[PDB]
Structure formats: C-alpha cells, structure tokens
C-alpha cells in the first residue's frame, strides 16, 4: 500500500507541475506543449 500510493503522490505532483507550467506558459511565444510519461508494471518486477 503505502509505498505505491506515496510514489503515486510524487507522480501526480510531477504531472500537476507539468500541466501548471503548460497553463502558465500558454502565452509564451514559441513555447512548446509539455507532457509527462509514466510506467509501473505487468506481472510484477518484485521477485516475491
């Protein structure tokens, strides 16, 4: 539980910062839209 949810807290912080920069810079000339990418899992990478 705790580790995954808190890691997600950090991930959300990153995504929110990205969108916040986007909306901030909506009127910077020559600015390019920014976006964030994420990655967790399939059948687990924890070996037990």
């Amino acid at each position: 539980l705790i580790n995954h949810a808190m890691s997600g807290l950090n991930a959300a912080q990153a995504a929110l910062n990205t969108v916040s920069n986007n909306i901030n810079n909506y009127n910077v000339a020559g600015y390019t839209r920014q976006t964030t990418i994420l990655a967790q899992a399939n059948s687990t990478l924890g070996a037990g």
Binding site: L1, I2, H4, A5, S7, G8, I37, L38, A39, Q40, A41, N42, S43
Partner: protein, 101 residues
C-alpha cells in the same frame, strides 16, 4: 489451527491490500490492466488444516476508454493483439501500450 486460520487469512488479506494499492497506483498508467489475487483453503489432514493458502493472480483484459491524442506516433490495438519489444539480452516481450518515438 483456529489461530492459524485467522493468521493465514490476515496475511492473505495483507497481500490483497497490496495488490489493491498497486491497482490505484496504476490507475492512469497507459494501457494498463487491473489485477487481483486468488485465495485457497489450507485444509489438510482433516477438519480445517491450518487456514488459507494463497497463490493466484487475476488480470482483466477488457479494453479501457481508448482515448484520442493526435500524435502521429500514438497507436492502440483494439481487442487482442500486442506489440513486440526487445532489450540488449536479445529477449522478446509483448506489450499493449502504443506511444512511440
């Protein structure tokens, strides 16, 4: 043992909680598919044995809301079908996520 029955169950429930937490953590991972674990009853010898034994995971393969993004390198396969990937070990892996560069 009654006590073991409970302990085993408690332990299993901890595993269930872990998988649920991971489900939330992945709740926006692109192409991801949700998970859950499977229990079993540790009957042995007679009566009830010791409690529950647990070795099993369940993953659903329904396709989520296939959202449109407009990049000329964003792809998704509706219904079964998967992409093939490799690493420096010469391995072969399959995946459903389709954002490329």
């Amino acid at each position: 043992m009654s006590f073991s029955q409970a302990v085993s169950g408690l332990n299993a429930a901890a595993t269930n909680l872990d998988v649920i937490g991971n489900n939330i953590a992945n709740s926006a991972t692109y192409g991801f598919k949700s998970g859950t674990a499977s229990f079993a009853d540790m009957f042995a010898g007679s009566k009830v044995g010791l409690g529950v034994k647990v070795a099993g995971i369940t993953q659903d393969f329904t396709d989520g809301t296939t959202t449109n993004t407009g990049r000329g390198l964003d792809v998704a396969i509706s219904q079964n079908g998967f992409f093939r990937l490799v690493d420096s070990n010469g391995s072969v892996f399959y995946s459903r996520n389709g954002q490329f560069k």
